Design a binder for these strands. Sequence first.
RNA 1: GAGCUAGCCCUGGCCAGGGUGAAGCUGGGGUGAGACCCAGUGGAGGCCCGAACCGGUGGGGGAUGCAAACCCCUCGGAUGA
RNA 2: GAAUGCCGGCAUGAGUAACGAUAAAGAGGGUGAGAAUCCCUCUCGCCGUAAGCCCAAGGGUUCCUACGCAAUGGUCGUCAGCGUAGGGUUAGGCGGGACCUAAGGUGAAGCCGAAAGGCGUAGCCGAAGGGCAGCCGGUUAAUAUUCCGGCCCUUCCCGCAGGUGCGAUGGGGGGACGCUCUAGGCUAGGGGGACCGGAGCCAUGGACGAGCCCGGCCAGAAGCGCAGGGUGGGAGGUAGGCAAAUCCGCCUCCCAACAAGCUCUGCGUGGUGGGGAAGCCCGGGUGACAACCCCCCGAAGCCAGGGAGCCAAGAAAAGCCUCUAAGCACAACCUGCGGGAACCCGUACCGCAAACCGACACAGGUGGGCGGGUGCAAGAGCACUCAGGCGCGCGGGAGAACCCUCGCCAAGGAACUCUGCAAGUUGGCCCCGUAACUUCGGGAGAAGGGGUGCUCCCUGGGGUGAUGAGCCCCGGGGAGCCGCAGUGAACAGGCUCUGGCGACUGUUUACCAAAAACACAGCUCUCUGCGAACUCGUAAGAGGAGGUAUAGGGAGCGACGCUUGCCCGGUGCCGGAAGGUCAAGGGGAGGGGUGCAAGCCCCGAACCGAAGCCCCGGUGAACGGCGGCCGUAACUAUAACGGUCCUAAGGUAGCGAAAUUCCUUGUCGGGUAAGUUCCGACCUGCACGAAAAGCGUAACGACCGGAGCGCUGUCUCGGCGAGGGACCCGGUGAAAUUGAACUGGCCGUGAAGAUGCGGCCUACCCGUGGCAGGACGAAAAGACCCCGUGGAGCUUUACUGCAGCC
RNA 3: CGAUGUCGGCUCGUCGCAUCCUGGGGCUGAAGAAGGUCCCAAGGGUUGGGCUGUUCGCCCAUUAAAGCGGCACGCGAGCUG
RNA 4: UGGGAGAGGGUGGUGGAAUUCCCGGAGUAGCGGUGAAAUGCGCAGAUACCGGGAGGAACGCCGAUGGCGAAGGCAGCCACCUGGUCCACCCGUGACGCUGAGGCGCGAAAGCGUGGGGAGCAAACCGGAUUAGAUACCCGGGUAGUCCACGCCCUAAACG
RNA 5: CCGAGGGUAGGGCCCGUGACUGGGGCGAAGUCGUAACAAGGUAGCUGUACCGGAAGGUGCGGCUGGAU
Lengths: 275, 48
Amino acid sequence: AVKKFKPYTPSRRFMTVADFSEITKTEPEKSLVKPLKKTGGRNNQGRITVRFRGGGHKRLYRIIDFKRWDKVGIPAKVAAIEYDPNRSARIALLHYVDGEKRYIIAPDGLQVGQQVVAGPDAPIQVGNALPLRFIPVGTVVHAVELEPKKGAKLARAAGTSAQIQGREGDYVILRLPSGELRKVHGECYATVGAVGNADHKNIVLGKAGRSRWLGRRPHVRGAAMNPVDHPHGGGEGRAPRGRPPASPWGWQTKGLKTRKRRKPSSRFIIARRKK
Amino acid sequence: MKRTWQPNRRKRAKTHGFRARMRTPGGRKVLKRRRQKGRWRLTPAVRK
RNA sequence: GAGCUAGCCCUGGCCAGGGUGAAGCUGGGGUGAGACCCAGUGGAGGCCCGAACCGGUGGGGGAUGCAAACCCCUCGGAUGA
RNA sequence: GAAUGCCGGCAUGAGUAACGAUAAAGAGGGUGAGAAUCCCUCUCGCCGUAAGCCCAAGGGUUCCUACGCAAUGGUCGUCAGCGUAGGGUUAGGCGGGACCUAAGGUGAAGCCGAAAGGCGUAGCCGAAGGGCAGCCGGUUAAUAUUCCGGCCCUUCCCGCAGGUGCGAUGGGGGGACGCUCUAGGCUAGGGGGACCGGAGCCAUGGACGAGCCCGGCCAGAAGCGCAGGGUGGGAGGUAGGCAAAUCCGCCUCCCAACAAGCUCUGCGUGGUGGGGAAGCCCGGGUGACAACCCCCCGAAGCCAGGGAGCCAAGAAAAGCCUCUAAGCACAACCUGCGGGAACCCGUACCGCAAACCGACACAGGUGGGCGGGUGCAAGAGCACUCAGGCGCGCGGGAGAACCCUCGCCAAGGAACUCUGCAAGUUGGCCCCGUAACUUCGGGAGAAGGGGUGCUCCCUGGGGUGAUGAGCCCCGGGGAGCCGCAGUGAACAGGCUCUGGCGACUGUUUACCAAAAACACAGCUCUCUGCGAACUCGUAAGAGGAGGUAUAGGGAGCGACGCUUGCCCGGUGCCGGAAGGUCAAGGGGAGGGGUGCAAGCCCCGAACCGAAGCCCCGGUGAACGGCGGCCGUAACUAUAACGGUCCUAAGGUAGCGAAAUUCCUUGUCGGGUAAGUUCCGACCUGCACGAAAAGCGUAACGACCGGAGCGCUGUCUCGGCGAGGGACCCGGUGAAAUUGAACUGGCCGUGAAGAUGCGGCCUACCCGUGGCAGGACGAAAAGACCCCGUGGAGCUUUACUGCAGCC
RNA sequence: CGAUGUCGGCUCGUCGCAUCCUGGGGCUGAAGAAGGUCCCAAGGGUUGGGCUGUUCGCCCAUUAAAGCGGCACGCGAGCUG
RNA sequence: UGGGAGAGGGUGGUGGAAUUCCCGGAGUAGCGGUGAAAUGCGCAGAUACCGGGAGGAACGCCGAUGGCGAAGGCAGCCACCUGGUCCACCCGUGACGCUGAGGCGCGAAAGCGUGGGGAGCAAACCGGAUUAGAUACCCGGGUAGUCCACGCCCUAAACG
RNA sequence: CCGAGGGUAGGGCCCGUGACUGGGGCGAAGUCGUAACAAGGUAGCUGUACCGGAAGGUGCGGCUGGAU
Ligand SMILES: CC(C)C[C@@H]1CCO[C@@H]2[C@H](CN[C@@H]2C(=O)N[C@H]2[C@H]3O[C@H](SCC/C=C\[C@H]2C)[C@H](O)[C@@H](O)[C@H]3O)C1
Ligand SMILES: [K+]
Ligand SMILES: [Mg+2]
Ligand SMILES: [Mg+2]
Ligand SMILES: [Mg+2]
Ligand SMILES: [Mg+2]
Ligand SMILES: [Mg+2]
Ligand SMILES: [Mg+2]
Ligand SMILES: [Mg+2]
Ligand SMILES: [Mg+2]
Ligand SMILES: [Mg+2]
Ligand SMILES: [Mg+2]
Ligand SMILES: [Mg+2]
Ligand SMILES: [Mg+2]
Ligand SMILES: [Mg+2]
Ligand SMILES: [Mg+2]
Ligand SMILES: [Mg+2]
Ligand SMILES: [Mg+2]
Ligand SMILES: [Mg+2]
Ligand SMILES: [Mg+2]
Ligand SMILES: [Mg+2]
Ligand SMILES: [Mg+2]
Ligand SMILES: [Mg+2]
Ligand SMILES: [Mg+2]
Ligand SMILES: [Mg+2]
Ligand SMILES: [Mg+2]
Ligand SMILES: [Mg+2]
Ligand SMILES: [Mg+2]
Ligand SMILES: [Mg+2]
Ligand SMILES: [Mg+2]
Ligand SMILES: [Mg+2]
Ligand SMILES: [Mg+2]
Ligand SMILES: [Mg+2]
Ligand SMILES: [Mg+2]
Ligand SMILES: [Mg+2]
Ligand SMILES: [Mg+2]
Ligand SMILES: [Mg+2]
Ligand SMILES: [Mg+2]
Ligand SMILES: [Mg+2]
Ligand SMILES: [Mg+2]
Ligand SMILES: [Mg+2]
Ligand SMILES: [Mg+2]
Ligand SMILES: [Mg+2]
Ligand SMILES: [Mg+2]
Ligand SMILES: [Mg+2]
Ligand SMILES: [Mg+2]
Ligand SMILES: [Mg+2]
Ligand SMILES: [Mg+2]
Ligand SMILES: [Mg+2]
Ligand SMILES: [Mg+2]
Ligand SMILES: [Mg+2]
Ligand SMILES: [Mg+2]
Ligand SMILES: [Mg+2]
Ligand SMILES: [Mg+2]
Ligand SMILES: [Mg+2]
Ligand SMILES: [Mg+2]
Ligand SMILES: [Mg+2]
Ligand SMILES: [Mg+2]
Ligand SMILES: [Mg+2]
Ligand SMILES: [Mg+2]
Ligand SMILES: [Mg+2]
Ligand SMILES: [Mg+2]
Ligand SMILES: [Mg+2]
Ligand SMILES: [Mg+2]
Ligand SMILES: [Mg+2]
Ligand SMILES: [Mg+2]
Ligand SMILES: [Mg+2]
Ligand SMILES: [Mg+2]
Ligand SMILES: [Mg+2]
Ligand SMILES: [Mg+2]
Ligand SMILES: [Mg+2]
Ligand SMILES: [Mg+2]
Ligand SMILES: [Mg+2]
Ligand SMILES: [Mg+2]
Ligand SMILES: [Mg+2]
Ligand SMILES: [Mg+2]
Ligand SMILES: [Mg+2]
Ligand SMILES: [Mg+2]
Ligand SMILES: [Mg+2]
Ligand SMILES: [Mg+2]
Ligand SMILES: [Mg+2]
Ligand SMILES: [Mg+2]
Ligand SMILES: [Mg+2]
Ligand SMILES: [Mg+2]
Ligand SMILES: [Mg+2]
Ligand SMILES: [Mg+2]
Ligand SMILES: [Mg+2]
Ligand SMILES: [Mg+2]
Ligand SMILES: [Mg+2]
Ligand SMILES: [Mg+2]
Ligand SMILES: [Mg+2]
Ligand SMILES: [Mg+2]
Ligand SMILES: [Mg+2]
Ligand SMILES: [Mg+2]
Ligand SMILES: [Mg+2]
Ligand SMILES: [Mg+2]
Ligand SMILES: [Mg+2]
Ligand SMILES: [Mg+2]
Ligand SMILES: [Mg+2]
Ligand SMILES: [Mg+2]
Ligand SMILES: [Mg+2]
Ligand SMILES: [Mg+2]
Ligand SMILES: [Mg+2]
Ligand SMILES: [Mg+2]
Ligand SMILES: [Mg+2]
Ligand SMILES: [Mg+2]
Ligand SMILES: [Mg+2]
Ligand SMILES: [Mg+2]
Ligand SMILES: [Mg+2]
Ligand SMILES: [Mg+2]
Ligand SMILES: [Mg+2]
Ligand SMILES: [Mg+2]
Ligand SMILES: [Mg+2]
Ligand SMILES: [Mg+2]
Ligand SMILES: [Mg+2]
Ligand SMILES: [Mg+2]
Ligand SMILES: [Mg+2]
Ligand SMILES: [Mg+2]
Ligand SMILES: [Mg+2]
Ligand SMILES: [Mg+2]
Ligand SMILES: [Mg+2]
Ligand SMILES: [Mg+2]
Ligand SMILES: [Mg+2]
Ligand SMILES: [Mg+2]
Ligand SMILES: [Mg+2]
Ligand SMILES: [Mg+2]
Ligand SMILES: [Mg+2]
Ligand SMILES: [Mg+2]
Ligand SMILES: [Mg+2]
Ligand SMILES: [Mg+2]
Ligand SMILES: [Mg+2]
Ligand SMILES: [Mg+2]
Ligand SMILES: [Mg+2]
Ligand SMILES: [Mg+2]
Ligand SMILES: [Mg+2]
Ligand SMILES: [Mg+2]
Ligand SMILES: [Mg+2]
Ligand SMILES: [Mg+2]
Ligand SMILES: [Mg+2]
Ligand SMILES: [Mg+2]
Ligand SMILES: [Mg+2]
Ligand SMILES: [Mg+2]
Ligand SMILES: [Mg+2]
Ligand SMILES: [Mg+2]
Ligand SMILES: [Mg+2]
Ligand SMILES: [Mg+2]
Ligand SMILES: [Mg+2]
Ligand SMILES: [Mg+2]
Ligand SMILES: [Mg+2]
Ligand SMILES: [Mg+2]
Ligand SMILES: [Mg+2]
Ligand SMILES: [Mg+2]
Ligand SMILES: [Mg+2]
Ligand SMILES: [Mg+2]
Ligand SMILES: [Mg+2]
Ligand SMILES: [Mg+2]
Ligand SMILES: [Mg+2]
Ligand SMILES: [Mg+2]
Ligand SMILES: [Mg+2]
Ligand SMILES: [Mg+2]
Ligand SMILES: [Mg+2]
Ligand SMILES: [Mg+2]
Ligand SMILES: [Mg+2]
Ligand SMILES: [Mg+2]
Ligand SMILES: [Mg+2]
Ligand SMILES: [Mg+2]
Ligand SMILES: [Mg+2]
Ligand SMILES: [Mg+2]
Ligand SMILES: [Mg+2]
Ligand SMILES: [Mg+2]
Ligand SMILES: [Mg+2]
Ligand SMILES: [Mg+2]
Ligand SMILES: [Mg+2]
Ligand SMILES: [Mg+2]
Ligand SMILES: [Mg+2]
Ligand SMILES: [Mg+2]
Ligand SMILES: [Mg+2]
Ligand SMILES: [Mg+2]
Ligand SMILES: [Mg+2]
Ligand SMILES: [Mg+2]
Ligand SMILES: [Mg+2]
Ligand SMILES: [Mg+2]
Ligand SMILES: [Mg+2]
Ligand SMILES: [Mg+2]
Ligand SMILES: [Mg+2]
Ligand SMILES: [Mg+2]
Ligand SMILES: [Mg+2]
Ligand SMILES: [Mg+2]
Ligand SMILES: [Mg+2]
Ligand SMILES: [Mg+2]
Ligand SMILES: [Mg+2]
Ligand SMILES: [Mg+2]
Ligand SMILES: [Mg+2]
Ligand SMILES: [Mg+2]
Ligand SMILES: [Mg+2]
Ligand SMILES: [Mg+2]
Ligand SMILES: [Mg+2]
Ligand SMILES: [Mg+2]
Ligand SMILES: [Mg+2]
Ligand SMILES: [Mg+2]
Ligand SMILES: [Mg+2]
Ligand SMILES: [Mg+2]
Ligand SMILES: [Mg+2]
Ligand SMILES: [Mg+2]
Ligand SMILES: [Mg+2]
Ligand SMILES: [Mg+2]
Ligand SMILES: [Mg+2]
Ligand SMILES: [Mg+2]
Ligand SMILES: [Mg+2]
Ligand SMILES: [Mg+2]
Ligand SMILES: [Mg+2]
Ligand SMILES: [Mg+2]
Ligand SMILES: [Mg+2]
Ligand SMILES: [Mg+2]
Ligand SMILES: [Mg+2]
Ligand SMILES: [Mg+2]
Ligand SMILES: [Mg+2]
Ligand SMILES: [Mg+2]
Ligand SMILES: [Mg+2]
Ligand SMILES: [Mg+2]
Ligand SMILES: [Mg+2]
Ligand SMILES: [Mg+2]
Ligand SMILES: [Mg+2]
Ligand SMILES: [Mg+2]
Ligand SMILES: [Mg+2]
Ligand SMILES: [Mg+2]
Ligand SMILES: [Mg+2]
Ligand SMILES: [Mg+2]
Ligand SMILES: [Mg+2]
Ligand SMILES: [Mg+2]
Ligand SMILES: [Mg+2]
Ligand SMILES: [Mg+2]
Ligand SMILES: [Mg+2]
Ligand SMILES: [Mg+2]
Ligand SMILES: [Mg+2]
Ligand SMILES: [Mg+2]
Ligand SMILES: [Mg+2]
Ligand SMILES: [Mg+2]
Ligand SMILES: [Mg+2]
Ligand SMILES: [Mg+2]
Ligand SMILES: [Mg+2]
Ligand SMILES: [Mg+2]
Ligand SMILES: [Mg+2]
Ligand SMILES: [Mg+2]
Ligand SMILES: [Mg+2]
Ligand SMILES: [Mg+2]
Ligand SMILES: [Mg+2]
Ligand SMILES: [Mg+2]
Ligand SMILES: [Mg+2]
Ligand SMILES: [Mg+2]
Ligand SMILES: [Mg+2]
Ligand SMILES: [Mg+2]
Ligand SMILES: [Mg+2]
Ligand SMILES: [Mg+2]
Ligand SMILES: [Mg+2]
């Protein structure tokens, strides 16, 4: 339920903000935070390697449990649902009966006070983690490991999910959030349900300063530059591309496929994304 | 207006100082050159 | 060589006073329940006026200068990108 | 003898410009060889959110005192930030170190690179962040939280006593955090007092007074008081916090729970120690046994790690507390008390500036704190003033032109001009009132108008106190008084109508462009399944991202509204197991050299043999492109209609003489007395047109047009006045430039524009103030233009390579 | 070409005459008045405004008239730009 | 009070047939389409056949001249929530009724906004035929839309 | 004091008029096609949507005021 504003400034006209209605705890778990080292897009050489980064709000990193096969069989209670600024999904604070406390990304519909559990025997309930092989065909699923014991890699952003399509030997077939059809090994863990905060996509930033808050520095069109800078630079007055549209580095940017040809994972992708 | 020389003792020592020169192939050649030429000062003097 | 300048990182600091009066909340009206209307409260905003501060719009002066970019009058921003 | 040659010396311009903010000076007295310029006194003016005071940087003896004036000081100099000498900086508590970690840096392990080197977890370094114990006064020519005085405090060592399972680099807690708004109680600071203390004063018409003028505090341990912060207590279970754990976490039960209790800060009080004005008299002494009290205002500071709301979700590590591990429990640790111990470096001075950065004693630049009073609605704004600090290191006259900054102006009022450029006007607050249009916020300070001082009388509410007085903050009603004028000075919008562009706030060519340019939310296309794509790197390694398709990269478009048509033949990109071509390599029909020969050696056809290219399809918010001629209607004209050629397809909607229209000031209409601009139309659009988007759009704009009202020295058309210069006298004294000069006019001549040649004319010698026609005047080896088989940036289906990718 | 600053305006003029007006004339298809045309004449005079950067030109209102040219398309060490 | 019939409405679930596409197998010279054709598709292996998978939309027979609703309109099956309505009994209230300017709600299709979804169909559009032309009728393609959620639009031969 | 009215400024309603533009009515013998009435040669009509020289065409859903 995105929230609107009255047009009492030019920007409040279109600005929308998340409702935060699912949130129940508004300061993080001190034992589970560490500082997030802002990079500005600069690598260890000091060089910009991702342009237009820097200047956003300060953040603490919340440690997230992307394994969950860490504590097979041990139930936990959902203590709180919190805001995480490092990701689009909300996060859920888990109180294990162990006394251990851990964060997971919060699936759609997960309720404070309910229990979750991980393992081959866990019930098929929103919030439970099982190896893919034991989850019924057709189940909607998130936080999917891509290789066993390597950690949840797929379907982690707000609103996304994967659907289990069928089995073939030691692999299950998944429809990824991109629509790709992929074989993922059956021992890979996954969590029942879709990721929450599905309204995330409908937020309207509203003003230029909002992008600045997020660490997004202004993006400069190539057509605005000079030939020293960009294939689209130069020209008296405005100019069309006047060549196939290109990146600052000269490679084409409308169509040119870029996935490496002889990649081994090609044997495991059934059908490229559509739409 | 604001001119270009804005002195700073720590900056001066960290940038041109003896230890900065020794840590680097090029800096050691500077000291070698300034010794061969007979410079009274191999490095800028800052109060430190 | 980034003690000038450009960007970013870490850690600190600064922004007189006045104006406008969003959401929400409360109450009253309204209805089958509502939406919603009114009042009070409230104090939002790349909101308004204006110092510090940051600028540099127009004109005049200066032009072997007070100054290798300054001075006067005027003018933009001033809780924010 | 020339090279705009090189180095040096010395000329010219010239006693010329200038002497660095227009805050401003005058006199008396001293000193001295010498005084506008040094010292003292009186008078005058300037700053006073500073032009005063305190920190930090940077500077480095510039500080204080004596003796000096050659040079430095834009003049002078007896003076000085100058010369010579002597002196001067005192810490367990202030700052930094013997503490901590941040980015970053460095780097056992390890990784990579021809060499040099590059990376890299821990660890270490790294501060203006965390942590940590000193306040007030006195003293020196010059230091003081440092010396001294008074009262306080910290750590380390040893000892005594009491207590306890003691013990850590290990576990845990805490430290520990945003932005805006903000409560209670205080403090700093300030105002008033008919109260308290004080040297005096009565002037010039009046006043001996509830008169004037001055001051009326500061620090403080325990205790106490007020206000706040922090914190649940007990028991049982326990598999988690990489060993252990009685701690922490999780579950359960009991009690306490707007509390309490314990603990910690702030403020008040507090033994005690200090301070203590005007005036007078020589920094000092007195005043003085100084008094040291009541009322009000009141922080942005303090209690604080306080409260609330919001989204963009807000360091680490140590100190500290707790837990236990080896170990040790004759130890150790905790508490109290006592004695001892407590190192290194900084400390002078300048510090919005004559001591820092600008070559200068340079109108520029330089971060943090304090920054008093009155009035103006408020305030750090404005005027004037306190404390304090200054009059800006050339002066004296004069009272021309002209220049600068400033004031006024009859009648007119934009007639000025590219343009109302500039300058007027308007101007704060309170009340009345306010249009099209609109995205319902706005447009809006729309416009336009009325009020505004002082006096007396009456009176409403808020704060303090007591519910009153008093004080204080907002008012309200009536009646009056004065002036040309009441925000009486200073600070403080001119307004409207209508177009173009860009939605908007923002950003930019440091130093000729601030814009219509860039950015911007938003829209679309495209790549990317994660050891992602992409980027930097030879690599290792990084960024992407401790992210995962609601995400990340690239590209265009640019809020929003209504929309975005047709063409895939060419280029691009995407798909295509066929076919064609295709390199190394495979294959070896068949030849050749040599040898007596076995052999050795060489050439080599068919055929098999990737990517790429060809070929077949797809694809426009991919690169791009979107016709010609002729005919036709019962007035004419014009063609809804037709014919034919061509194309991949022949420009749709909307718009149109436009930021685009050549002809062009198109034509018509509006506005004006008059309109190449403007606005509204028309459409034969030289040469609009749909994301290099098309057409609109409220609001916004130091953008660019056009009009009107208001008002003006812009102008008719100039006048007067002020100050700083210009001018004259005293002091100091540049500059570009310069073949040399004894350097006139005309008409001719001359390399074609003559002071210099010819002829004539004119003209005694030398200056000073002015003006700019000439000396093809000066600063600059033309930047336009060409030339050079000169250079450099940029482009591409120029050539040829290379990275990269296949 | 080791620089002869370039359009328009402003200011300041000065000159030529192929004369726009004013003065003197001859001819007229000159009744008068008013014109036309040519001759002599450079003494003086030759307006304000709208448009446009404009020179020019068009237009408004006047006038005796609203002259045309030269002076580096006069004049930027005089201004504008 | 006791019963009833019903595609009345809303939410969730779920079943088979068919179409399309994808994969595997088998197989070869055409398939498709019409009045006839052509475009199209097919030796790069189509059509026709078998097995597997994916996905959306509509529910054959029953089915009627049927039923339900105020209308618009409603059809596989299942559960839940819910409206109307009729019959019986003759038990309760005691005229508590009829209509209804305004108001409010509902309102097929198409259309609009924001997300999703997209098999079939199909405005626009392209192509092939026809024709004097053919911006049509017929044929091959084909985008909105048709579907879901929420919010609008409020029309109709909304008719008996 | 009130006060006819005058002045200044800003709104509301109405009438007249305007380059040009939109369709409408009408007009003895104009041009283009033939949409409708017969199954009008594609049954017609319909609300809406999109397109086209024009009548119209097509999509979706509706009506019979449709024939056989
Ligand atoms: C049509 C036109 C293109 C012809 C052309 C006009 C331009 O110039 C003129 C050329 C002829 N030579 C002239 C010239 O060089 N003039 C110089 C000036 O430079 C500045 S004046 C400001 C700059 C102006 C002009 C510069 C080019 C100095 O002061 C002057 O002394 C002078 O050197 C012709
Ligand atoms: K040129
Ligand atoms: Mg909004
Ligand atoms: Mg609204
Ligand atoms: Mg939420
Ligand atoms: Mg921590
Ligand atoms: Mg690094
Ligand atoms: Mg990048
Ligand atoms: Mg960046
Ligand atoms: Mg993310
Ligand atoms: Mg979140
Ligand atoms: Mg796998
Ligand atoms: Mg989005
Ligand atoms: Mg952020
Ligand atoms: Mg951009
Ligand atoms: Mg460009
Ligand atoms: Mg550019
Ligand atoms: Mg570059
Ligand atoms: Mg290049
Ligand atoms: Mg390039
Ligand atoms: Mg280009
Ligand atoms: Mg360009
Ligand atoms: Mg162009
Ligand atoms: Mg450009
Ligand atoms: Mg091009
Ligand atoms: Mg390209
Ligand atoms: Mg894919
Ligand atoms: Mg600077
Ligand atoms: Mg600096
Ligand atoms: Mg330093
Ligand atoms: Mg420093
Ligand atoms: Mg430094
Ligand atoms: Mg360095
Ligand atoms: Mg060094
Ligand atoms: Mg070396
Ligand atoms: Mg070496
Ligand atoms: Mg030496
Ligand atoms: Mg050196
Ligand atoms: Mg270097
Ligand atoms: Mg710097
Ligand atoms: Mg620095
Ligand atoms: Mg501010
Ligand atoms: Mg304020
Ligand atoms: Mg106001
Ligand atoms: Mg509230
Ligand atoms: Mg603002
Ligand atoms: Mg305002
Ligand atoms: Mg300026
Ligand atoms: Mg001005
Ligand atoms: Mg200059
Ligand atoms: Mg200035
Ligand atoms: Mg000023
Ligand atoms: Mg402002
Ligand atoms: Mg402000
Ligand atoms: Mg010679
Ligand atoms: Mg010489
Ligand atoms: Mg020279
Ligand atoms: Mg030379
Ligand atoms: Mg020389
Ligand atoms: Mg020399
Ligand atoms: Mg010499
Ligand atoms: Mg010399
Ligand atoms: Mg000399
Ligand atoms: Mg001489
Ligand atoms: Mg001289
Ligand atoms: Mg001279
Ligand atoms: Mg001078
Ligand atoms: Mg000077
Ligand atoms: Mg001044
Ligand atoms: Mg002045
Ligand atoms: Mg005097
Ligand atoms: Mg004097
Ligand atoms: Mg003197
Ligand atoms: Mg003297
Ligand atoms: Mg003086
Ligand atoms: Mg003196
Ligand atoms: Mg005197
Ligand atoms: Mg003051
Ligand atoms: Mg120095
Ligand atoms: Mg001297
Ligand atoms: Mg002297
Ligand atoms: Mg001497
Ligand atoms: Mg001197
Ligand atoms: Mg000087
Ligand atoms: Mg003397
Ligand atoms: Mg000293
Ligand atoms: Mg001490
Ligand atoms: Mg030590
Ligand atoms: Mg350390
Ligand atoms: Mg190498
Ligand atoms: Mg190394
Ligand atoms: Mg270091
Ligand atoms: Mg350290
Ligand atoms: Mg520190
Ligand atoms: Mg300390
Ligand atoms: Mg103390
Ligand atoms: Mg002291
Ligand atoms: Mg103990
Ligand atoms: Mg915390
Ligand atoms: Mg934290
Ligand atoms: Mg901090
Ligand atoms: Mg915030
Ligand atoms: Mg106090
Ligand atoms: Mg006060
Ligand atoms: Mg006290
Ligand atoms: Mg345990
Ligand atoms: Mg504290
Ligand atoms: Mg005494
Ligand atoms: Mg403050
Ligand atoms: Mg605090
Ligand atoms: Mg708090
Ligand atoms: Mg750390
Ligand atoms: Mg033991
Ligand atoms: Mg023992
Ligand atoms: Mg030591
Ligand atoms: Mg000191
Ligand atoms: Mg300053
Ligand atoms: Mg300061
Ligand atoms: Mg000084
Ligand atoms: Mg001076
Ligand atoms: Mg200065
Ligand atoms: Mg005071
Ligand atoms: Mg005020
Ligand atoms: Mg002075
Ligand atoms: Mg001054
Ligand atoms: Mg002076
Ligand atoms: Mg004189
Ligand atoms: Mg006067
Ligand atoms: Mg006048
Ligand atoms: Mg006027
Ligand atoms: Mg007037
Ligand atoms: Mg005008
Ligand atoms: Mg202009
Ligand atoms: Mg204008
Ligand atoms: Mg004025
Ligand atoms: Mg004013
Ligand atoms: Mg109006
Ligand atoms: Mg209005
Ligand atoms: Mg208007
Ligand atoms: Mg409008
Ligand atoms: Mg409105
Ligand atoms: Mg007003
Ligand atoms: Mg009044
Ligand atoms: Mg008065
Ligand atoms: Mg104003
Ligand atoms: Mg703009
Ligand atoms: Mg712009
Ligand atoms: Mg635009
Ligand atoms: Mg717009
Ligand atoms: Mg925009
Ligand atoms: Mg702004
Ligand atoms: Mg603004
Ligand atoms: Mg420039
Ligand atoms: Mg510039
Ligand atoms: Mg420059
Ligand atoms: Mg400028
Ligand atoms: Mg510009
Ligand atoms: Mg601007
Ligand atoms: Mg720009
Ligand atoms: Mg924009
Ligand atoms: Mg848009
Ligand atoms: Mg999109
Ligand atoms: Mg690279
Ligand atoms: Mg990172
Ligand atoms: Mg990372
Ligand atoms: Mg992106
Ligand atoms: Mg842009
Ligand atoms: Mg609109
Ligand atoms: Mg094409
Ligand atoms: Mg094609
Ligand atoms: Mg193509
Ligand atoms: Mg082209
Ligand atoms: Mg082409
Ligand atoms: Mg169209
Ligand atoms: Mg036109
Ligand atoms: Mg025109
Ligand atoms: Mg236009
Ligand atoms: Mg054009
Ligand atoms: Mg034209
Ligand atoms: Mg033209
Ligand atoms: Mg005209
Ligand atoms: Mg007209
Ligand atoms: Mg027009
Ligand atoms: Mg025309
Ligand atoms: Mg384009
Ligand atoms: Mg263009
Ligand atoms: Mg437009
Ligand atoms: Mg607008
Ligand atoms: Mg603007
Ligand atoms: Mg602007
Ligand atoms: Mg005007
Ligand atoms: Mg004047
Ligand atoms: Mg004067
Ligand atoms: Mg004289
Ligand atoms: Mg002299
Ligand atoms: Mg000579
Ligand atoms: Mg001579
Ligand atoms: Mg002479
Ligand atoms: Mg002469
Ligand atoms: Mg000649
Ligand atoms: Mg001559
Ligand atoms: Mg001569
Ligand atoms: Mg001669
Ligand atoms: Mg001679
Ligand atoms: Mg001769
Ligand atoms: Mg001669
Ligand atoms: Mg002669
Ligand atoms: Mg003569
Ligand atoms: Mg003279
Ligand atoms: Mg002179
Ligand atoms: Mg001259
Ligand atoms: Mg001149
Ligand atoms: Mg010459
Ligand atoms: Mg000359
Ligand atoms: Mg000359
Ligand atoms: Mg020059
Ligand atoms: Mg040359
Ligand atoms: Mg040159
Ligand atoms: Mg040439
Ligand atoms: Mg050549
Ligand atoms: Mg040659
Ligand atoms: Mg060349
Ligand atoms: Mg080159
Ligand atoms: Mg190479
Ligand atoms: Mg690539
Ligand atoms: Mg030349
Ligand atoms: Mg020369
Ligand atoms: Mg020249
Ligand atoms: Mg003029
Ligand atoms: Mg007659
Ligand atoms: Mg004459
Ligand atoms: Mg003209
Ligand atoms: Mg001309
Ligand atoms: Mg003309
Ligand atoms: Mg006449
Ligand atoms: Mg002339
Ligand atoms: Mg000429
Ligand atoms: Mg010419
Ligand atoms: Mg000229
Ligand atoms: Mg000039
Ligand atoms: Mg000129
Ligand atoms: Mg000149
Ligand atoms: Mg000259
Ligand atoms: Mg075959
Ligand atoms: Mg599908
Ligand atoms: Mg009964
Ligand atoms: Mg409806
Ligand atoms: Mg479709
Ligand atoms: Mg019917
Ligand atoms: Mg009257
Ligand atoms: Mg029909
Ligand atoms: Mg018919
Ligand atoms: Mg029909
Ligand atoms: Mg027919
Ligand atoms: Mg059609």
